[PDB]
């Protein structure tokens, strides 16, 4: 199972970890993936995360986009987990450099609470924008079900353990 993980509260642990090396490894039921509406896994955890499934991620995500349309901002989808994971959650989180509402990410994680453990990214921080440290706050006060934060950054991971509540 999860190793090396600190102990946030009595349902989040984390990790200064490449979430690709974490799925790789762990093989977890869900890996969270920090998606677009389009699913387009260019950079960031998306890309690592797609790049590591040799693209097979992104053709399955052009087909369930083709069907379903885009997702909402806040919203989810479960697709395959590929050689990473049993299956992928999708999460968008409110992408702040795209001009998106911070608001949407307490929506955003509420995802994670239809499944009963994953492995995540932190929703809407690095490239997406958000303060990592209030991303980190809204994850613990609304996901309820367990869930292992890998931070693929040493700094951050080392400013949000010292400065965690
Ligand atoms: O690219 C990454 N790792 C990886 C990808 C493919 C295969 C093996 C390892 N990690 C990463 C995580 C978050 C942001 N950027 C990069
Ligand atoms: O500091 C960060 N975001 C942020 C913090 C405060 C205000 C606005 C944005 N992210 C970050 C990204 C990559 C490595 N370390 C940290």
Redesign the pocket.
């Known amino acids: 199972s999860f190793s090396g993980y600190l102990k946030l509260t009595d349902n989040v642990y984390i990790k200064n970890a490449d979430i690709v090396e974490e799925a790789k490894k762990v093989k977890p039921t869900v890996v969270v993936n920090a998606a677009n509406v389009y699913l387009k896994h260019g950079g960031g955890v998306a890309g690592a995360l797609n790049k590591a499934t040799n693209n097979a991620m992104q053709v399955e995500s052009d087909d369930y986009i083709a069907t379903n349309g885009p997702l909402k901002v806040g919203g989810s989808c479960v697709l395959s987990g590929h050689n990473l994971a049993k299956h992928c959650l999708h999460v968008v989180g409110p992408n702040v450099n795209k001009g998106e509402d911070i608001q949407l990410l307490k929506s955003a994680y509420e995802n994670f609470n239809q499944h009963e453990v994953l492995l995540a990214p932190l929703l809407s921080?690095?490239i997406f924008?958000?303060?990592?440290?209030h991303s980190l706050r809204v994850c613990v006060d609304t996901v309820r079900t367990n869930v292992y934060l890998a931070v693929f950054?040493k700094?951050?991971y080392d400013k949000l353990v010292s400065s965690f509540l």
């Open positions: 921080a690095g924008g958000a303060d990592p440290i950054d700094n951050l």
